[PDB]
Design an enzyme around this catalytic site. Structure first.
Site, mmCIF file in Angstrom:
data_model
loop_
_atom_site.group_PDB
_atom_site.id
_atom_site.type_symbol
_atom_site.label_atom_id
_atom_site.label_comp_id
_atom_site.label_asym_id
_atom_site.label_seq_id
_atom_site.Cartn_x
_atom_site.Cartn_y
_atom_site.Cartn_z
ATOM 1 N N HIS A 146 10.118 -17.490 -8.742
ATOM 2 C CA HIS A 146 9.897 -17.321 -10.191
ATOM 3 C C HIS A 146 8.430 -17.356 -10.539
ATOM 4 C CE1 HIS A 146 13.749 -19.983 -10.135
ATOM 5 N NE2 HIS A 146 14.147 -18.727 -10.144
ATOM 6 N N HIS B 97 6.063 -18.858 -13.048
ATOM 7 C CA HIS B 97 5.960 -19.953 -13.998
ATOM 8 C C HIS B 97 4.791 -19.696 -14.952
ATOM 9 C CE1 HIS B 97 8.910 -23.130 -12.540
ATOM 10 N NE2 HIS B 97 9.131 -22.081 -11.768
ATOM 11 N N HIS C 62 9.456 -21.467 -16.539
ATOM 12 C CA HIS C 62 9.423 -20.033 -16.329
ATOM 13 C C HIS C 62 8.702 -19.316 -17.441
ATOM 14 C CE1 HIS C 62 13.184 -20.533 -13.596
ATOM 15 N NE2 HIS C 62 12.082 -21.047 -13.083
ATOM 16 N N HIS D 37 14.473 -14.774 -18.232
ATOM 17 C CA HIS D 37 13.062 -15.002 -18.450
ATOM 18 C C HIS D 37 12.291 -13.881 -17.757
ATOM 19 C CE1 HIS D 37 14.383 -19.479 -18.244
ATOM 20 N NE2 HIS D 37 14.301 -19.124 -19.512
ATOM 21 N N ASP E 162 11.795 -14.462 -14.053
ATOM 22 C CA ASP E 162 13.009 -14.578 -13.213
ATOM 23 C C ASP E 162 13.130 -13.458 -12.169
ATOM 24 O OD1 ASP E 162 13.657 -16.865 -14.681
ATOM 25 O OD2 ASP E 162 15.287 -15.920 -15.781
HETATM 26 CU CU CU Z 1 11.128 -21.566 -11.025
HETATM 27 ZN ZN ZN Z 2 14.095 -18.647 -15.464
#
Ligand code: CU
Ligand code: ZN
Ligand code: CU
Ligand code: CU
Ligand code: CU
Ligand code: ZN
Ligand code: ZN
Ligand code: ZN
Lengths: 151, 151, 151, 151
Positions: D44, D46, D61, D78, D81
């Site tokens: 992910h 961030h 995220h 997100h 993601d």
């Molecule tokens: Cu994460």
């Molecule tokens: Zn997420």
């Protein structure tokens, strides 16, 4: 503007910087000029801050009262008539003039015009010939600069 | 004064003549600059008619309304913000500007101030650093001259 | 992005945290570096946010205006030229810089680039060799990190 | 920027390098990660490129559309993601992701943010609990790096 400056440059070695400061109803003209032959040199505000063809394009003495040429002390004078600066044996002239007729604002303002130092002494209109009544027989323009607003 | 002229000179090959004329209620700026690199160069009226330290002593942009730097079409601009001149492949820039903020007399007068051509394009105050809000990131001063009264 | 942060790490004892904040029209740089030798150390934004070969892969100084290396007060400088940080006798440098060329968005953004602290003082491009015009003879990269968006 | 890079580091043995390249309206994410336990690991972007307290200071995220967590194929997700990367028996994961939502420029740009590889698989929001809708139950942050502009 209460302060002005001029950098004098020419095609030869003559150069200098002139400072102008409004004090009461006068302008106080100071500075120095190097590379000059010893003796007096005509020192005049010329009409135009035009250096496109060098000092020659500055035109004649600044003369909004349409008078003949004289010394700074004379009633009959051009506004641009500041007399003579004097170079020593080292070629250096220190300029210290106080004049009531030139101005840094209003109708007789010299901002945007040209300061010129001359080949020969200015005879102050007393030379007995036509040229004397025009330029003071000061001859060629050794160096000049446009008069600018200074900090 | 209804006409002015400026002769641009620097330490390098860049030179030119700029003409100013009061026409109607505005000021028309013409002339040409040579010896430039191809492309855009910032073109600005700087505050002081002071060439004592070359172009550096001209100070910042002429800014009597105490605004931030912009393009000439912008509301938020200095009076001296005339944007960019454009040099062709031969290094020649043709100057053609009409401007609503500059004048040739009174508060907005640029007579006795300095015309500067810069090394780099003017980003019109939109570059996003602090420098952009001062100079448009136009960089160094290639050539400049004091604006003088013309015949 | 109005705040950024950088964590400096290298092969040796040198470490620190640098904070960036967009304040008014400028960028304020604060923080501290520890484990330094007493005296001055070059402090520069390098072009690439690339730590794949430690600090080496950061490339040269961030220089979108294609200038030569200088000090942060100089006209001829790279955007990444933030001069020197100064370590005291305990190896601690307090960082306090305001800078007109860097930004946190747009063309001048240093987000995603690399902050480097160098082994030696930055000579501000005045050392007189070719290296001076590139890096100020600041030498090796003691510690660096990628500039990231901060909360 | 059309190219970006991230070096993943943590407090354990997990490390790797991630490359990012703008292609059409996508970002193509490639690279490799070593030292991982076999199987899927949440992967992910961030929010913050803040490593001052390690991966934890990267925050949640990256989520500028204020949605819940899902898989990269989900509408509800997100921006950060990117689903799961898969480690083999040797602990190695080869990363090959193409994503339309992340960007290397403009509003959804991930430059200056943090890439994180996670302890556990990302359940893609389908875990049936509150945590699933936040992080995909991917657990702890094994390694991370700030996303930087690459040559
Ligand atoms: Cu994460
Ligand atoms: Zn997420
Ligand atoms: Cu004369
Ligand atoms: Cu300028
Ligand atoms: Cu450096
Ligand atoms: Zn006369
Ligand atoms: Zn300006
Ligand atoms: Zn540099």
């Amino acid at each position: 503007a209460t302060k002005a400056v001029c950098v004098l440059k020419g095609d030869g070695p003559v150069q200098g910087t002139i400072h102008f400061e409004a004090k009461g109803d006068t302008v106080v003209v100071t500075g120095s000029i190097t590379g000059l032959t010893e003796g007096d040199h005509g020192f005049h505000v010329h009409q135009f801050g035009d250096n496109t063809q060098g000092c020659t394009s500055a035109g004649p003495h600044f003369n909004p009262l349409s008078k003949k040429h004289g010394g700074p002390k004379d009633e009959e004078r051009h506004v641009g008539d500041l007399g003579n600066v004097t170079a020593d044996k080292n070629g250096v002239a220190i300029v210290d003039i106080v004049d009531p007729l030139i101005s840094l604002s209003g109708e007789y303002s010299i901002i945007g015009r040209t300061m010129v130092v001359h080949e020969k002494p200015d005879d102050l209109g007393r030379g007995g010939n036509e040229e004397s009544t025009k330029t003071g027989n000061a001859g060629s323009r050794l160096a000049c600069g446009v008069i600018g607003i200074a900090k």
